[PDB]
Design an enzyme around this catalytic site. Structure first.
Site, PDB file in Angstrom:
ATOM      1  CB  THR A   1       4.755  -6.050  30.996  1.00 24.59           C
ATOM      2  OG1 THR A   1       4.688  -7.162  31.898  1.00 24.59           O
ATOM      3  CG2 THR A   1       6.072  -5.310  31.224  1.00 24.59           C
TER       4      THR A   1
ATOM      5  CE  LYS B   1       2.718  -9.000  28.421  1.00 32.19           C
ATOM      6  NZ  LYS B   1       2.434 -10.233  29.113  1.00 32.19           N
TER       7      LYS B   1
HETATM    8  C1  LIG Z   1       2.644 -10.191  30.430  1.00 33.04           C
HETATM    9  C2  LIG Z   1       2.346 -11.377  31.395  1.00 33.04           C
HETATM   10  C3  LIG Z   1       2.341 -11.201  32.774  1.00 33.04           C
HETATM   11  C4  LIG Z   1       2.492  -9.809  33.425  1.00 33.04           C
HETATM   12  O1  LIG Z   1       1.205  -9.192  33.577  1.00 33.04           O
HETATM   13  P1  LIG Z   1       0.943  -7.988  34.606  1.00 33.04           P
HETATM   14  O2  LIG Z   1      -0.437  -7.631  34.303  1.00 33.04           O
HETATM   15  O3  LIG Z   1       2.052  -6.991  34.490  1.00 33.04           O
HETATM   16  O4  LIG Z   1       0.986  -8.505  36.131  1.00 33.04           O
HETATM   17  C5  LIG Z   1       2.012 -12.237  33.590  1.00 33.04           C
HETATM   18  N1  LIG Z   1       1.658 -13.428  33.066  1.00 33.04           N
HETATM   19  C6  LIG Z   1       1.642 -13.622  31.739  1.00 33.04           C
HETATM   20  C7  LIG Z   1       1.155 -14.939  31.231  1.00 33.04           C
HETATM   21  C8  LIG Z   1       1.996 -12.604  30.882  1.00 33.04           C
HETATM   22  O5  LIG Z   1       1.926 -12.779  29.488  1.00 33.04           O
HETATM   23  N1  LIG Z   2       6.005  -9.291  37.754  1.00 33.11           N
HETATM   24  C1  LIG Z   2       6.830  -8.856  38.707  1.00 33.11           C
HETATM   25  O1  LIG Z   2       7.269  -9.595  39.581  1.00 33.11           O
HETATM   26  C2  LIG Z   2       7.514  -7.485  38.883  1.00 33.11           C
HETATM   27  O2  LIG Z   2       8.363  -7.242  37.738  1.00 33.11           O
HETATM   28  C3  LIG Z   2       7.652  -6.908  36.520  1.00 33.11           C
HETATM   29  C4  LIG Z   2       8.672  -6.677  35.405  1.00 33.11           C
HETATM   30  O3  LIG Z   2       9.587  -5.673  35.834  1.00 33.11           O
HETATM   31  C5  LIG Z   2       6.825  -5.562  36.771  1.00 33.11           C
HETATM   32  O4  LIG Z   2       6.148  -5.151  35.593  1.00 33.11           O
HETATM   33  C6  LIG Z   2       5.833  -5.765  37.952  1.00 33.11           C
HETATM   34  O5  LIG Z   2       5.210  -4.505  38.189  1.00 33.11           O
HETATM   35  C7  LIG Z   2       6.553  -6.281  39.260  1.00 33.11           C
HETATM   36  O6  LIG Z   2       5.616  -6.737  40.218  1.00 33.11           O
END
Ligand SMILES: *Cc1c(COP(=O)(O)O)cnc(C)c1O
Ligand SMILES: NC(=O)[C@H]1O[C@H](CO)[C@@H](O)[C@H](O)[C@H]1O
Ligand SMILES: O=c1[nH]cnc2c1ncn2[C@@H]1O[C@H](COP(=O)(O)O)[C@@H](O)[C@H]1O
Ligand SMILES: O=c1[nH]cnc2c1ncn2[C@@H]1O[C@H](COP(=O)(O)O)[C@@H](O)[C@H]1O
Ligand SMILES: *Cc1c(COP(=O)(O)O)cnc(C)c1O
Ligand SMILES: NC(=O)[C@H]1O[C@H](CO)[C@@H](O)[C@H](O)[C@H]1O
Lengths: 830, 830
Positions: B664, B668
């Site tokens: 996610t 962003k």
């Molecule tokens: C959005 C978010 C995540 C998820 O990041 P990914 O790159 O999907 O692993 C993890 N930590 C914080 C602080 C976030 O804002």
């Molecule tokens: N952060 C995570 O543990 C998991 O769930 C998140 C939200 O579904 C995913 O985007 C990620 O790929 C997966 O590893």
């Protein structure tokens, strides 16, 4: 409605909208789902709002003017509820009553929802609370300092006649009165070791616990002064309590933070009994270490933290600071103050000691040996290594003073030592306090004399100027106006209101002792009180009593020295006499005994079982009828005391002469229209002396008689042999008359009574029942009973804590009380 | 100032006086001693006031209308700060900004004081927070249910290049957003045993822990809807946790209450990794047991708790309730719902099962085996004996379904079983969830297909209708408007404001892709963002970076599958090339790598040490100059993400194809003007597909390539043998070039890379650095880089959580979203 203040038009309207603001914005509820508990909180927040303005200006005031500051250190503060008391001291009671009424609610019903602040065991903690109220009322720049236990004195439950203890989660729903001040958190050290390097010792490798303060407002009586009670909470640092690395587990390290935070978790439920547990010692050092840092910080600012001579000269410390030690619990303040002055500020020993002695004062509260704090040296050695070294040095210098004054008196030396040799070496905290304070006081005249004559004789001979007396007192605000508005109103009708902060004025009531209307009124309010209590009883506890009978009550902690057992023997005697001559008239009595027993006190718990056992028999005997009822008042506490005392006719203060240092419950009963049957012990002596012995039911041995008996040797068999009525009771206990299913249930009580009664219950038995006959005689004459009552009430003025504080102030602290109204609460925002 | 709303005359004045009310009455401070922290709280309370009115009517509304209720169960909720977000959703930002300005304070400075609500690990917890915001914005009667940990994700400290973990005491100063509801406390059972008596089983002799709720308001975007997030706290009962008598100690019994309360003490810091600890299982059952009771209570009232057919018919339960399982953490909800329906409500098994399956839906988040929850049966057996029995019965019936559909397929039977035989028997929670839910979904298209093709193939063949997909999304409110007001403003200048709750409208920006002013603006805000971040860096962390260089950032939890190591190899390559031809021009880059490693993940912690080790070398080489900087972003969290993402040029989403379920953070970066270099993994595929592969930097193996290699057998020596640049790096690591004092420090990394690389880092090395060369080429052409950026931003609309929720709503929950403004907040007091 009464003189609970004015119910002004503008203010009742203002109160209502603010009550609604909070119910909505603070509680986030709407009238349709709001419960009595919510209503209580809306009101509490609404009342609290009125004293923040005053709280802020009071504190700011002290900062500007910079007067001498009083610091009352105590491990206990038995506050009870605070909603009504606040209304009373702010003249808000009638306005709140009106407003809540218009909102369609019963203020009294809401008041019952507030949880008691049970951060104390009994007398010692309640004294502290009464003192705070008085210091605020007398305009003293005073601060109450203690520990914010999340679990106060346990709630008592009677199951099958036995006491059951259960955690007092008083914070469960929140405390609207306190204000957390995380921004003023302070660190406190434990363990470690001492490094002696070049220029001074260093306390090193210590474990740190953080002390987070919580301030509660203490409003004076109608003078716009709101002082502060600062209670400390233990918090774990987030570093070392996680950062001391190299395997253990990250989760486990976070869970283990509740080890440093256990320090302020629970109050020790011992009354007049010393338990040498490490957790207790930690609580003791904790409150002292945090408090002193706060004290010195405030001092460093004063007007020295601007200019003055310029050079942190602690020579003026005693002119700006006064710390009162409530018992020996906060005794580490002495060696701690030396450690900071010597180790940190680098003053020379002698200058530092001169400062310490001049700022510290100690109050003693008991003479029984098992209550004396004697900490094993191996404990201090491990937990506070530098303090132990300082204590040995204080002892060294002191003993040298002694040797020089009493050359060759080698036994005096060992007797006076702060260090006790023997099985295990111990530190006598009381000796420490006497050596490091400029004033030591008792809590009643006889007790104070006993200190000088007995327990601290050697110390008195060395420094006679240190010993004083300050007879205890109680606050007429909570203990009269608050719990007995009916009595307060009729008194005010004749002599006005100025007596609430000048109780001496109650003497003017002497001239109404023959007044027909007054006698009728005094008797009326007591009957209204008894009816209300009789109702509450069936309401909350369920199983009827008769409001016409004499209300014979003894409420205080369960102890062997307080002799609830002696009260038990009389009750059984009444029972046995009735069973002997059923159709003979006797004055009806409801004898109510209430009190908590410390969890580990086996005897005390055995006594509670006896009391209930007697009631099981007495209360179900058809021949007795309504002439005699034995009731055990469950969970006796401040809020309960406020209900029973105003409804009592007879107050039982029957401790063995020379064991009750003072007592204060006795004074509560006296100011509320109950007559006192008691021994010449503690403050009983001064009360009888104030009212005249003819208006008091005194009996039993005096202190001198007790000592004579001890020289002789006390033998309970004698009394057993010469009194058939007594013999009959002991054999009833022994044969299971009171415990059918378990015939030997009370063998420990009997065994003790006959062979190891340290408090000679039998010795006062005859004079006690004889004396009980005289009160029954007088109760049969309503008019004369009430006239004697008026003699007691009219003469109780000396027992107000305002008088006590005014003496501490002038004779110990060196400050002048003042009944000057602080410049209004008025808005202001600089 | 921007479209942070109107700064109305009446409202800025109203805000100011309320700010002063709270500073005085709530904080009990005066302007002369107030600190920034106090100012922050006054503002927070002032802002909170504005949504209580809406909170109350929203909840009342749902009670009146009684729509279908959505319950989002998750053990994690990564909320971050909530002051600004609340201002944004209430259109209060400019008014607050103005008012605080007039009060002489900097709102931005105060906003920095609020502590992050770190009740999550990463993606899974943040998804939950984004979902809540969206469900509120789409007017769904939705509730977030979880655990109120007093210690969230640990704060990371880098000491000597190593990660140091320290407790996150986020509640230390208080939480002005939550509202304790002690009045709704519920009991939760543990241990005990099962009694099978006449008419049903009975869960007996259990230990009780109390669940106390705390509600936090969740405001929708400008529609006056404020939903509730209910977080449970563990509390010990005051009875048995004291009352189970017969020696132990009264003190110890009170201290031991912190054993039942340890349940909600700390969040488990594992991301995509399963730890079978008893404390975790307890947390899991705790949130489920309490939540369900609340769910059924609300159901029993509804309109059934009035009339309807009359007879608690749970047939309508699924028409009124929908519970979403965020991963398998809350999987016990299935057997728990059966236990309540069967054991307590007495429904027959089949009717009960039909109800359970129809109300429960499960979301899967990962395919890696080590993240799968397989609880040992001996644990369930002891802790939740009746649930184990129910699970065995669910398995029995399910397997019978299988046998009947696939007659004779004996291996399918063992493969599908909820019970796994072997070393120790275990319960496969994922299998449980599939059997007990009516819908199972993946979080991105490829991931969902992988579930059907691989991991849950057998289940898909049995019930193909259960499997769906719901591509993740993020909230444009916090992730655009809040963190990047500058970009949001220039977009609004061209297409208006309706895109904030309708992100699809961002496509209209495509028609400005050749607009000269827009290109200049988009490039301007990104330069302003980079400058602000470059400043913050020296402000709070200290040691300069160059704002003109390309901002290459990879921020996410440290994992082997996320390949920060692959990023490391490229950085070293850049370094080595520069050292080879110093005087050759290269595009300058500041590569920022940030992320937290789970405390027990040795490799992950070793990687963090490597990153810092590279920076020590690279950052102090004079030949490199300002052309290359390697920085490790400390304590990466939500609030930090809000700072770096808007300042990034290059987003690194380089996980091995088929390992990142969705991601996610990638979304962003896309909505904030950064270009993406990544693999065809998770949502990366849909993002490239939405923007066009020409506007994306895709490289490396696809899922099919990975499988081919595995058939073949992955051998890292090959790559080592054929790529000299790669060989040179591995030998630099091996010989101590990056760790002089400890030459063998990185032997585990090298050893792994060469012999047990589960994620074939070497296999994508060549295509990665080749692809990195193409972005450097494009960055040299500012105008074209910004035009490609506009193609990404303009095409990110599909990745809003509003879209995701609207699909869950229609395809799983059976409810219709609505962008209808709730009838104002307007006073009212019934
Ligand atoms: C959005 C978010 C995540 C998820 O990041 P990914 O790159 O999907 O692993 C993890 N930590 C914080 C602080 C976030 O804002
Ligand atoms: N952060 C995570 O543990 C998991 O769930 C998140 C939200 O579904 C995913 O985007 C990620 O790929 C997966 O590893
Ligand atoms: O440095 C200062 N400037 C102005 N007022 C002060 C200062 N220090 C204390 N005060 C005031 O004195 C009160 C007493 O604070 P204390 O230190 O907690 O006793 C504070 O709440 C302020 O009103
Ligand atoms: O019995 C009831 N009477 C009136 N309003 C109710 C009642 N029960 C719930 N409500 C309203 O519905 C809101 C929802 O409460 P919940 O049970 O926590 O979901 C409450 O805050 C009230 O406004
Ligand atoms: C006043 C008070 C005490 C002290 O009573 P004594 O009779 O002096 O022992 C103890 N407990 C409570 C609840 C009190 O109000
Ligand atoms: N309650 C107590 O512990 C002690 O202190 C009280 C207050 O000084 C005294 O009245 C009491 O006689 C003594 O036992």
């Amino acid at each position: 409605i009464s003189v609970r203040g004015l119910a002004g038009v503008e203010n009742v309207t203002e109160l209502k909208k603010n009550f609604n603001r909070h119910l909505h914005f603070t509680l986030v509820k709407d009238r349709n789902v709001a419960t009595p508990r919510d209503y209580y909180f809306a009101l509490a927040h609404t009342v609290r709002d009125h004293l923040v303005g005053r709280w802020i200006r009071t504190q700011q005031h002290y900062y500007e003017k910079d007067p001498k500051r009083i610091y009352y250190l105590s491990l206990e503060f038995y506050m009870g509820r605070t909603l009504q008391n606040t209304m009373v001291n702010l003249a808000l009671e009638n306005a709140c009553d009106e407003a809540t009424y218009q909102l369609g609610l019963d203020m009294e019903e809401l008041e019952e929802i507030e949880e008691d602040a049970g951060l104390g065991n009994g007398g010692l903690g309640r004294l502290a609370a009464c003192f705070l109220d008085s210091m605020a009322t007398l305009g003293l720049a005073a601060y109450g300092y203690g520990i914010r236990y999340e679990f106060g004195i346990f709630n008592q439950k009677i199951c099958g006649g036995w006491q059951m203890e259960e955690a007092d989660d008083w914070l469960r729903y929140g405390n609207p009165w306190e204000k957390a001040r995380p921004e003023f958190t302070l660190p406190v050290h434990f363990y470690g070791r001492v490094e002696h390097t070049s220029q001074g010792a260093k306390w090193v490798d210590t474990q740190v616990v953080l002390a987070m303060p919580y301030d509660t407002p203490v409003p004076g009586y109608r003078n716009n002064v709101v002082n502060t009670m600062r209670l400390w909470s233990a918090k774990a640092p987030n570093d070392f309590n996680l950062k001391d690395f190299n395997v253990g587990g990250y989760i486990q390290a976070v869970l283990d933070r509740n080890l440093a935070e256990n320090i302020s978790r629970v109050l020790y439920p011992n009354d007049n009994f010393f338990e040498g547990k490490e957790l207790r010692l930690k609580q003791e050092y904790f409150v002292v270490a945090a408090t002193l840092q706060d004290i010195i910080r405030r001092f460093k600012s004063s007007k020295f933290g601007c200019r003055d001579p310029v050079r942190t000269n602690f020579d003026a410390f005693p002119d700006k600071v006064a710390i009162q030690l409530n018992d020996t619990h906060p005794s580490l303040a002495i060696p701690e103050l030396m450690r900071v002055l010597v180790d940190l500020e680098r003053l020379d020993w002698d200058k530092a000691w001169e400062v310490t002695v001049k700022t510290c004062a100690y109050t003693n509260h008991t003479v029984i040996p098992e209550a004396l704090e004697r900490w094993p040296v191996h404990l201090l050695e491990t937990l506070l290594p530098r303090h132990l070294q300082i204590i040995y040095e204080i002892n060294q210098r002191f003993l040298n003073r002694v040797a020089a004054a009493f050359p060759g008196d080698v036994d005096r030396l060992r007797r006076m030592s702060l260090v006790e040799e023997g099985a295990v070496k111990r530190i006598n905290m009381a000796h420490l306090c006497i050596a490091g304070s400029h004033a030591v006081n008792g809590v009643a005249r006889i007790h104070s004399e006993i200190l000088k004559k007995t327990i601290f004789k050697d110390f008195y001979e060395l420094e006679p100027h240190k010993f004083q007396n300050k007879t205890n007192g109680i606050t007429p605000r909570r203990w009269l106006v608050l719990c007995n508005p009916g009595l307060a109103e009729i008194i005010a009708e004749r002599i006005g209101e100025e007596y609430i902060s000048d109780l001496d004025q109650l003497r003017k009531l002497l001239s109404y002792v023959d007044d027909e209307a007054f006698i009728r009124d005094v008797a009326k309010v007591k009957q209204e009180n008894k009816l209300k209590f009789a109702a509450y009883l069936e309401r909350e506890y369920k199983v009827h009593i008769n409001p016409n009978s004499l209300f014979d009550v003894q409420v205080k902690r369960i102890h062997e020295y307080k002799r609830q057992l002696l009260n038990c023997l009389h009750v059984i005697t009444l029972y046995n006499r009735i069973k002997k001559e059923p159709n003979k008239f006797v004055v009806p009595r409801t004898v109510m005994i209430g009190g908590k027993a410390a969890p580990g006190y086996h005897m005390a718990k055995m006594i509670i079982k006896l009391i209930t056992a007697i009631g099981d028999v007495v209360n179900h005997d058809p021949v007795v009828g309504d002439r005699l009822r034995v009731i055990f008042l469950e969970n006796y506490r401040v809020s309960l005391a406020e209900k029973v005392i105003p409804a009592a006719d007879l107050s039982e203060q029957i401790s063995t002469a020379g064991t009750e240092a003072s007592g204060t419950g006795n004074m509560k009963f006296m100011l509320n229209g109950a007559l006192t049957i008691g021994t010449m012990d503690g403050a009983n002596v001064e009360m009888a002396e104030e009212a005249g012995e003819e208006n008091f039911f005194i009996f039993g041995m005096r202190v001198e008689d007790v000592d004579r008996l001890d020289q002789r040797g006390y033998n309970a068999q004698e009394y057993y042999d010469r009194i058939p009525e007594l013999r009959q009771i002991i054999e009833q206990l022994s044969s299971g008359f009171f415990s059918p299913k378990q015939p030997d249930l009370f063998k420990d009580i009997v065994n003790m009574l006959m062979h190891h009664d340290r408090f000679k219950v039998f010795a006062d038995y005859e004079e006690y029942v004889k004396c009980q006959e005289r009160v029954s005689a007088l109760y049969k004459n309503p008019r004369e009973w009430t006239r004697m009552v008026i003699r007691n009430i009219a003469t109780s003025g000396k027992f107000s804590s305002d008088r006590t504080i005014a003496q501490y102030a002038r004779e110990i602290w060196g400050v002048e009380p003042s009944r000057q109204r602080l410049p209004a609460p008025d808005e202001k925002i600089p």
